[PDB]
Design an enzyme around this catalytic site. Structure first.
Site, short mmCIF file in Angstrom:
data_model
loop_
_atom_site.label_atom_id
_atom_site.label_comp_id
_atom_site.label_asym_id
_atom_site.label_seq_id
_atom_site.Cartn_x
_atom_site.Cartn_y
_atom_site.Cartn_z
N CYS A 106 28.77 32.51 -25.52
CA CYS A 106 29.11 31.62 -26.61
C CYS A 106 30.16 30.62 -26.19
CB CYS A 106 29.61 32.40 -27.82
SG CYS A 106 28.25 33.00 -28.71
N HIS A 160 33.00 31.72 -34.98
CA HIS A 160 32.98 33.17 -35.09
C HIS A 160 33.89 33.85 -34.07
CE1 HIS A 160 30.39 33.57 -31.57
NE2 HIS A 160 29.34 33.02 -32.15
N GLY A 210 28.89 37.03 -24.24
CA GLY A 210 29.98 36.36 -23.56
C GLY A 210 29.74 34.89 -23.30
C1 LIG Z 1 26.26 39.96 -35.68
C2 LIG Z 1 26.57 38.56 -35.16
C3 LIG Z 1 27.17 38.45 -33.92
C4 LIG Z 1 27.46 37.18 -33.45
N1 LIG Z 1 28.08 36.94 -32.18
C5 LIG Z 1 29.44 36.96 -32.10
C6 LIG Z 1 30.33 37.31 -33.30
C7 LIG Z 1 31.18 38.53 -32.93
C8 LIG Z 1 32.22 38.83 -34.02
C9 LIG Z 1 30.27 39.75 -32.78
N2 LIG Z 1 30.02 36.70 -30.92
C10 LIG Z 1 29.29 36.40 -29.85
C11 LIG Z 1 29.95 36.14 -28.66
C12 LIG Z 1 29.21 35.82 -27.54
O1 LIG Z 1 29.86 35.54 -26.34
C13 LIG Z 1 27.83 35.78 -27.59
O2 LIG Z 1 27.12 35.45 -26.44
C14 LIG Z 1 27.17 36.04 -28.77
O3 LIG Z 1 25.76 35.97 -28.77
C15 LIG Z 1 27.92 36.36 -29.92
C16 LIG Z 1 27.33 36.63 -31.12
O4 LIG Z 1 26.14 36.59 -31.23
C17 LIG Z 1 27.17 36.05 -34.21
C18 LIG Z 1 26.58 36.17 -35.46
C19 LIG Z 1 26.28 37.44 -35.93
F1 LIG Z 1 25.69 37.57 -37.17
#
Ligand SMILES: Cc1cc(-n2c(CC(C)C)nc3cc(O)c(O)c(O)c3c2=O)ccc1F
Ligand SMILES: Cc1cc(-n2c(CC(C)C)nc3cc(O)c(O)c(O)c3c2=O)ccc1F
EC number: 3.4.19.12
Lengths: 300, 300
Positions: free
Chosen positions: A145, A41, A143
């Site tokens: 991920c 993602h 942040g």
């Molecule tokens: C709505 C949604 C958000 C996410 N998402 C995304 C994806 C981005 C394009 C918004 N990037 C992240 C980066 C991080 O560093 C982190 O800690 C996170 O928790 C996430 C995260 O959750 C994953 C699935 C989802 F359906």
């Protein structure tokens, strides 16, 4: 003496953490040999998440859309591809700090250490269990991920977890390093929620043994129970069933303390039925279930 | 979201851990630049410990009595000397992995990470607090002497603890890196015991704030208390007095949650007088006191 939630020394993993930027998103990647692993993602925008076709978004990308930074040094991306829910960015430099490693998938009930990272920079290390419902009760801010979970065995880092997202109850969901989620979670926007959880019985037993090894004895008793009679009590209190294999695994700890597994089960039954009456076990007023039998032997 | 006892990434300290052997004793040493630091009782035999004159035992030693091993590489000892309760073994090689470091002494109530080591090999990392009675509730087996405690700030490792011995209650006693013991303990055989301990009030408050930041709110209330009325309750329940400076330190956390410090003190008073009535805060059924205000801001 003493008993703490102890992580593995994180140095071997710290040398693999990098920063991966695509568009306006920066998250963490795992740099092993000439490949950088990160959540897929990273290629998404916020508005893509409703129904992303990741096959789409990736073919619309090229190598120069991915900025990879190892400390201060930029890494040149020469290839990209998808494996399940992770992205593999091939870089032009093999990581000279690559430890011996494995990608292993763990079982619910096993533990591992998490190196929480932000912008490729390690922030902290702690112990986690994979819950029976395939979530982990981590500590992750936005942040984080790409942060990974791992065990170390001799010299070999067995990577078992990569962080992808936080669920509505505040617990955490992720994949193994081949990109396959733990549990029924997906990397797209849904109302997905953690399923109901249970307590890891064999771990609670292991921790009671750690307690006896450390001089906590007030919960012992002269009773034994049958495996079947204990399991009737376990189901009432939302504990995993105990199997003969669990009993076998607890053997060493049983031998070291001289307390038969089913003798300790009787104590666990009393603790579940009566509570603790204001006393503590290893500094806790709750029954701890995030120490495996291996964790206990390792530390005691 | 989530809140865990989080250590600092230990890699910077792992690169400094070595093995120091003298006679039949092998313990751990800290290798920074061309000096190896370790407990001075490495030069003792078991029967020396009743009334060792360490000035004695050291003049009867020479450089070749000390075997220093960094991983597989033997380090040549070219000088030895004593500073208080630590030994400084000068070696012929500066450690190329020497991080920027400081020797700082911490206060009771502050926290740090411990890299538990055996035979110079790191075994695990975890968080500790220095108790108000200058012991630490660590996890140490025989062989762990020389293991160090530390904080990391940006790139700089502030070493604050070296492990020397376990006390009769199973808690741990040690020195700063200049060789001065924390608390009224000595490195010789006595009946020394941990003095009475107290609970670190400002830390409990900080952890309650971490709980509110993470969605635990059932213990909040509409009351406020005076600082003096809270301190009357603190002394009854064996808590450190709360000072205005503590109140000042809690400011950021107070501002972020919108809960005034003295508002949170009223909640702490209720928790002390009523208990928890079967509920939990951040997964604990006890009031946690080993998170400083800094630890909370760091993690939240
Ligand atoms: C709505 C949604 C958000 C996410 N998402 C995304 C994806 C981005 C394009 C918004 N990037 C992240 C980066 C991080 O560093 C982190 O800690 C996170 O928790 C996430 C995260 O959750 C994953 C699935 C989802 F359906
Ligand atoms: C009776 C006594 C023992 C010790 N002692 C010694 C000293 C040795 C000559 C027996 N060496 C250790 C090595 C470790 O690796 C470790 O973990 C330890 O706890 C100790 C330790 O306690 C310290 C003061 C004392 F009065």
């Amino acid at each position: 003496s003493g008993f703490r939630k102890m992580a593995f020394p994180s140095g071997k993993v710290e040398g693999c953490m990098v920063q991966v930027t695509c568009g306006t998103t920066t998250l963490n990647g795992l740099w092993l040999d000439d490949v950088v692993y990160c959540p897929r993602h990273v290629i998404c925008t916020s508005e893509d998440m409703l129904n992303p076709n990741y096959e789409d978004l990736l073919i619309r990308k090229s190598n120069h859309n991915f900025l990879v930074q190892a400390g201060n040094v930029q890494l040149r991306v020469i290839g990209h591809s998808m494996q399940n829910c992770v992205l593999k960015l091939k870089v032009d430099t093999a990581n000279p700090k690559t430890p011996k490693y494995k990608f292993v998938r763990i079982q619910p009930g096993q533990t591992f250490s998490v190196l929480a990272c932000y912008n490729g920079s390690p922030s902290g290390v702690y112990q986690c269990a994979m819950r029976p419902n395939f979530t982990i009760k981590g500590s992750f801010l936005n942040g984080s991920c790409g942060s990974v979970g791992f065990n170390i065995d001799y010299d070999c880092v067995s990577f078992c977890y990569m962080h992808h997202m936080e669920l509505p109850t505040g617990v955490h969901a992720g994949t193994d390093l081949e990109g396959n989620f733990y549990g029924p979670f997906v990397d797209r926007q849904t109302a997905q929620a953690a399923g109901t959880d249970t307590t890891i019985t064999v771990n609670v037993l292991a921790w009671l043994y750690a307690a006896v090894i450390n001089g906590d004895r007030w919960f012992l008793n002269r009773f034994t129970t049958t495996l079947n009679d204990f399991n009737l009590v376990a189901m009432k209190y939302n504990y995993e069933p105990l199997t003969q294999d669990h009993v076998d695994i607890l053997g060493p700890l049983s031998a070291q303390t001289g307390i038969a597994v089913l003798d300790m089960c009787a104590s666990l039954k009393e603790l579940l039925q009566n509570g603790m009456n204001g006393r503590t076990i290893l500094g806790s007023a709750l029954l701890e279930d995030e120490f495996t039998p291996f964790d206990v032997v390792r530390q005691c």
